[PDB]
Every structure is written in structure tokens, then in C-alpha cells.
């Protein structure tokens, strides 16, 4: 019952949505690596990026907003 990436289906990942100012893919990755996180698949989202991190990680990156992505969303 391992957590699986919402991007790729691979087990061992939790997909987050990342947003931030002048956020680019290299900057995002660099900021995560700077927190000592293993980074899995990263892909562009609408308004930011999706990024896979290990389920056990507790990502708090300054100025950067990271929330777990949901598999589905409603019309709110
Ligand atoms: Na399995
Ligand atoms: Na684009
Ligand atoms: Na765009
Ligand atoms: Zn857009």
C-alpha cells in the first residue's frame, strides 16, 4: 500500500504542487536539494510545478509554497 506518484504511478513518491515567485524548474529543484530532499519526477503544472518527493519527507522551503497534490478535484 505504498504511496504512489500521481505523475508517473511509481511507488515511493508523494506528488506535491509547488508555487513561488519567478519559480523555474532549476530553481525549484535547487531549493529542494538545498533542504536535503531527494527529488523525483518534476513537471510543469498550471501556475507552478508538480514535484515528487519521498512520502516521509516534510518539505518546508522558504518563500516556496508546497502542498500535496490531490488525485482529483471538484468544481468547488
Ligand atoms: Na507493489
Ligand atoms: Na508553459
Ligand atoms: Na504558462
Ligand atoms: Zn496558465
UniProtKB/TrEMBL annotation:
Transmembrane spans: none
Domain of life the protein comes from: Bacteria
Residues binding Zn(2+) 1: 3
Residues binding Zn(2+) 3, per UniProt: 46
Positions of Zn(2+) 2 binding: 10
Family: Belongs to the DEAD box helicase family.
Name of the protein in its database record: Heat resistant RNA dependent ATPase
Organism the protein comes from: Thermus thermophilus (strain ATCC BAA-163 / DSM 7039 / HB27)
Residues of the full protein shown: 431 to 505 of 517
Amino acid at each position: 500500500a505504498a504511496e504512489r506518484s500521481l505523475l508517473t504511478g511509481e511507488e515511493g513518491w508523494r506528488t506535491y504542487k509547488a508555487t513561488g515567485p519567478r519559480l523555474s524548474l532549476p530553481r525549484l529543484v535547487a531549493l529542494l536539494k538545498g533542504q536535503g530532499l531527494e527529488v523525483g519526477k518534476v513537471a510543469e503544472a498550471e501556475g507552478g510545478f508538480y514535484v515528487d518527493l519521498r512520502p516521509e519527507a516534510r518539505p518546508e522551503v522558504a518563500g516556496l509554497r508546497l502542498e500535496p497534490a490531490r488525485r482529483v478535484e471538484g468544481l468547488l
